[PDB]
Amino acid sequence: GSHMVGQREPAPVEEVKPAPEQPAEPQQPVPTVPSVPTIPQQPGPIEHEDQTAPPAPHIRHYDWNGAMQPMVSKMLGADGVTAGSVLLVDSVNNRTNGSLNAAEATETLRNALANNGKFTLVSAQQLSMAKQQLGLSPQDSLGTRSKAIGIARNVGAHYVLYSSASGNVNAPTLQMQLMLVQTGEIIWSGKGAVSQQ
Numbered sequence: 700g701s702h703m704v705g706q707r708e709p710a711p712v713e714e715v716k717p718a719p720e721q722p723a724e725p726q727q728p729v730p731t732v733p734s735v736p737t738i739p740q741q742p743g744p745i746e747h748e749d750q751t752a753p754p755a756p757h758i759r760h761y762d763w764n765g766a767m768q769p770m771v772s773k774m775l776g777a778d779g780v781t782a783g784s785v786l787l788v789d790s791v792n793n794r795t796n797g798s799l800n801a802a803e804a805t806e807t808l809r810n811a812l813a814n815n816g817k818f819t820l821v822s823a824q825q826l827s828m829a830k831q832q833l834g835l836s837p838q839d840s841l842g843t844r845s846k847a848i849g850i851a852r853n854v855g856a857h858y859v860l861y862s863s864a865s866g867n868v869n870a871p872t873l874q875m876q877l878m879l880v881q882t883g884e885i886i887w888s889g890k891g892a893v894s895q896q
């Protein structure tokens with residue numbers, strides 16, 4: 700508000716005489732005009748993947764040893780079996796009321812088979828493989844004498860221990876069965892209700 704007010708004018712129209720010129724000072728010396736351009740539609744990342752990979756959950760644990768051991772103990776007292784054989788422990792089946800880690804069982808097989816000492820246990824390094832080599836899974840079980848015999852001989856075994864679980868999955872009947880691989884006949888069999896660990 701520096702000057703340029705002219706408070707209390709006379710009455711007749713008149714230009715401000717107590718002011719020679721005093722021009723209106725420029726607010727901005729720049730005669731510039733801002734400008735914002737529209738942004739074109741840029742695409743986003745596609746990012747493809749490389750085939751889905753099933754995480755695959757984990758199963759319980761059963762006291763398979765509680766099932767196998769007493770049976771393994773019988774299996775070697777079976778007619779057809781001999782101490783000192785390599786016993787192709789088959790995958791345990793899971794025929795139960797549900798789903799179980801019969802491969803866990805099948806491991807326990809070897810284990811219960813191991814504790815009784817009269818056999819020579821094959822490793823899944825052979826067995827599991829053989830199953831796959833032949834078709835199956837280390838879990839699927841041989842399911843078929845010749846599939847068993849295939850594996851057992853592909854594995855280096857004298858026998859087969861056909862095992863399974865039925866009844867109730869949480870606590871199944873471990874239905875076991877000792878197939879001679881060299882003939883494919885059932886020389887021993889059993890069942891034993893396994894526990895959940």
